[PDB]
Amino acid sequence: EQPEPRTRRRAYLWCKEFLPGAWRGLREDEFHISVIRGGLSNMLFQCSLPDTTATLGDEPRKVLLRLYGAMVLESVMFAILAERSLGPKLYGIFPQGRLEQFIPSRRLDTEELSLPDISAEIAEKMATFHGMKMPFNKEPKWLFGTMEKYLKEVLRIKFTEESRIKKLHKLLSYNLPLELENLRSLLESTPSPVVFCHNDCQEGNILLLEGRENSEKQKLMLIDFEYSSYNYRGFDIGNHFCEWMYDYSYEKYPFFRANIRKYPTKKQQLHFISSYLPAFQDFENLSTEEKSIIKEEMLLEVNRFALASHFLWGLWSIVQAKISSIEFGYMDYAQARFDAYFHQKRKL
Amino acid sequence: RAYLWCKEFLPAWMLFQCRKVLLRLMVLESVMFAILAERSLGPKLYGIFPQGRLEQFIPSRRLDTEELSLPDISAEIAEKMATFHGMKMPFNKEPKWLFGTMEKYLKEVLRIKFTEESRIKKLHKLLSYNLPLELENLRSLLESTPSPVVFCHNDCQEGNILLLEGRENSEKQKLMLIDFEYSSYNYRGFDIGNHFCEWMYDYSYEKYPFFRANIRKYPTKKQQLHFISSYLPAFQNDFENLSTEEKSIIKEEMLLEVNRFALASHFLWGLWSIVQAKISSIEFGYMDYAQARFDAYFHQKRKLGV
Numbered sequence: 001e002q003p004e005p006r007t008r009r010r011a012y013l014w015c016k017e018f019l020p021g022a023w024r025g026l027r028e029d030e031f032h033i034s035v036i037r038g039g040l041s042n043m044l045f046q047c048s049l050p051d052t053t054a055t056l057g058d059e060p061r062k063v064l065l066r067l068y069g070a071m072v073l074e075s076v077m078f079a080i081l082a083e084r085s086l087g088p089k090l091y092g093i094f095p096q097g098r099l100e101q102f103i104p105s106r107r108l109d110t111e112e113l114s115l116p117d118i119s120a121e122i123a124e125k126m127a128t129f130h131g132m133k134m135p136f137n138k139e140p141k142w143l144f145g146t147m148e149k150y151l152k153e154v155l156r157i158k159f160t161e162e163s164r165i166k167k168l169h170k171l172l173s174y175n176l177p178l179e180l181e182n183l184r185s186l187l188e189s190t191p192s193p194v195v196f197c198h199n200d201c202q203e204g205n206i207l208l209l210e211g212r213e214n215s216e217k218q219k220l221m222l223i224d225f226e227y228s229s230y231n232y233r234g235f236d237i238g239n240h241f242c243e244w245m246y247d248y249s250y251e252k253y254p255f256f257r258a259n260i261r262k263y264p265t266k267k268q269q270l271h272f273i274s275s276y277l278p279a280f281q282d283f284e285n286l287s288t289e290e291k292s293i294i295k296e297e298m299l300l301e302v303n304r305f306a307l308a309s310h311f312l313w314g315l316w317s318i319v320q321a322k323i324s325s326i327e328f329g330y331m332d333y334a335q336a337r338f339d340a341y342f343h344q345k346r347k348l
Numbered sequence: 349r350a351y352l353w354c355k356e357f358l359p360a361w362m363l364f365q366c367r368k369v370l371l372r373l374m375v376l377e378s379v380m381f382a383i384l385a386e387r388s389l390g391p392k393l394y395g396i397f398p399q400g401r402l403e404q405f406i407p408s409r410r411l412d413t414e415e416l417s418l419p420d421i422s423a424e425i426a427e428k429m430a431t432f433h434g435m436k437m438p439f440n441k442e443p444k445w446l447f448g449t450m451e452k453y454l455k456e457v458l459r460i461k462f463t464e465e466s467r468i469k470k471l472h473k474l475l476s477y478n479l480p481l482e483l484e485n486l487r488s489l490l491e492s493t494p495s496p497v498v499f500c501h502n503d504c505q506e507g508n509i510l511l512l513e514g515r516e517n518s519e520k521q522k523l524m525l526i527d528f529e530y531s532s533y534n535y536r537g538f539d540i541g542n543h544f545c546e547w548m549y550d551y552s553y554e555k556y557p558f559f560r561a562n563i564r565k566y567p568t569k570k571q572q573l574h575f576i577s578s579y580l581p582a583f584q585n586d587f588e589n590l591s592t593e594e595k596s597i598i599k600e601e602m603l604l605e606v607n608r609f610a611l612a613s614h615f616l617w618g619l620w621s622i623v624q625a626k627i628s629s630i631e632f633g634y635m636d637y638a639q640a641r642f643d644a645y646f647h648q649k650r651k652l653g654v
């Protein structure tokens with residue numbers, strides 16, 4: 001798929017000016033660009049040298065262009081992670097978007113999240129991620145801050161179409177402001193270390209790296225850090241566990257399927273946290289009685305913060321049903337998370 | 349407002365001091381400082397927010413103007429500047445900054461209207477040079493002067509070079525370059541020319557105009573050769589292994605390049621200073637600095653016969 005003429009010309013000039021080597025002297029007519037994703041916001045494109053053009057040095061043959069359609073911290077964050085080799089290299093940054101490394105890879109599917117070697121490696125990459133120092137605020141205000149913010153906007157929504165007004169009423173019927181306070185009180189008393197969290201560690205943000213599909217522990221990369229921040233570790237792990245249940249690649253409306261039965265088993269959760277804990281801390285040296293005590297408390301911790309994943313992204317999805325024009329069943333998804341919230345709450 | 353910044357961003361928890369940190373009260377500059385901190389070429393970045401940022405406090409002092417000519421300082425600044433020029437950065441590599449900023453300030457200068465009469469007179473003397481005509485002579489000259497576009501500091505002066513406390517007896521690693529607010533992809537000759545110009549200017553004078561200019565303190569040819577003899581192997585991997593003849597070819601051609609681009613330091617900072625005299629609330633003789641830079645511009649033209 002070819003972008004429209006203005007984009008191709010803007011893309012061309014960003015590459016030509018930001019990228020070194022053969023890129024600097026490329027003609028418009030030589031420029032190769034194709035759409036990875038369209039839409040009004042965050043369109044992605046692969047830009048490329050002709051195959052017949054030689055590179056002069058260690059410039060890339062292709063790059064990813066991200067057009068937008070917190071900009072400071074998101075940018076600084078992307079730059080630091082690029083420096084640290086935890087994300088894609090940053091080649092250019094500008095008001096309209098970025099030029100990034102093109103990583104030959106595909107995203108994991110939802111079903112691959114339960115594969116033990118995959119899970120174990122997600123565990124490890126996440127632990128690593130949680131261990132880094134980042135020049136942002138270390139006070140854990142993101143979770144209930146963000147939730148408070150969405151609840152206020154949700155409370156002020158007036159829908160005009162019937163099926164939407166129907167859905168909003170049912171969700172409103174639970175007394176979300178009250179339910180938020182109980183949730184806050186549950187987690188108030190649930191210790192969780194504040195660490196630098198991805199906050200959206202899902203299959204859509206984990207790349208299965210090309211070549212390394214034979215590799216057991218080194219075939220993955222976490223990407224798309226827009227929600228990242230210092231936050232309770234339990235949310236990051238709990239949110240990941242919830243993501244086993246959500247498939248955002250379904251092709252008919254509402255364009256996701258939720259399956260409560262696909263939440264990891266205790267056996268599965270334990271397999272995750274058992275990779276995470278020695279990766280994060282040494283831990284293999286503790287007594288198996290202390291290691292179980294720690295593991296068991298973590299399970300409760302992460303399953304309790306799981307509830308914040310349901311509440312936050314449920315609230316988020318209601319806001320999106322109002323302000324977003326993307327083709328997704330945002331209200332159906334709101335209900336699904338709130339269903340899962342009450343189910344999980346009833347399990348606990 | 350800043351006690352909180354430390355409580356929240358730092359983990360026991362204008363420019364101020366606070367183990368010890370520095371607070372400084374934008375996307376490009378932030379990314380840039382973050383990258384340089386990551387690569388240990390800058391002070392560590394501990395905090396970043398809208399109203400400022402928390403940085404590492406580095407026990408040091410700035411160099412003095414007179415120290416730029418110490419052979420060892422001069423040699424290390426060359427090395428450090430070479431290193432800086434070798435960096436990749438996610439920024440535009442088309443060299444827009446130099447003439448873009450001169451045009452920017454020229455346009456402003458051509459519509460500055462001062463209130464005070466002495467500033468009116470001083471500006472009148474400066475506009476008597478026909479600054480737009482002269483920018484075109486500079487453009488013409490520099491466009492015929494090949495100079496590689498590199499990542500330039502663009503303000504490599506004594507006030508932005510730390511002498512690191514406890515490293516004073518080190519012959520080659522006692523300095524750090526800071527303050528990258530003017531840094532951009534630019535002609536290399538500008539960064540070197542500007543630094544050469546900076547041997548003449550002392551911004552620490554305690555009495556009005558609050559600088560000194562000594563034109564006799566511009567580096568001599570030997571002093572300049574010493575600088576570039578250190579710059580060149582630092583920056584060019586194959587340079588040390590070249591013939592003594594091929595080396596001198598490059599040096600001689602480099603001397604012409606840097607001394608030609610030095611004219612742009614004088615012209616840019618000359619224009620910058622007229623604009624500052626209008627807008628700045630700092631106490632400094634901006635108009636007298638303007639005049640010193642343009643005097644030095646025409647003097648240098650005459651030196652070079654251009």
Ligand SMILES: C[N+]1(C)CCO[C@@](O)(c2ccc(-c3ccc([C@@]4(O)C[N+](C)(C)CCO4)cc3)cc2)C1
Pocket residue numbers: 200202204248249251255313316326327328
């Ligand atoms: C192909 N269509 C039918 C039209 C084009 O967009 C879609 O491809 C599409 C795919 C995925 C999504 C999607 C929605 C929400 C999320 C999310 O994980 C984002 N958050 C994690 C922020 C909140 C929870 O839901 C991920 C993907 C939305 C639309 C659906």
Ligand SMILES: C[N+]1(C)CCO[C@@](O)(c2ccc(-c3ccc([C@@]4(O)C[N+](C)(C)CCO4)cc3)cc2)C1
Pocket residue numbers: 503505507551552554558617620630631632
């Ligand atoms: C490189 N540039 C960007 C252009 C050339 O001039 C500069 O190097 C420059 C640097 C420092 C100063 C400067 C300004 C104010 C002061 C002072 O301390 C003087 N007083 C003591 C009078 C009051 C407070 O400000 C000292 C140095 C002025 C210009 C800045």
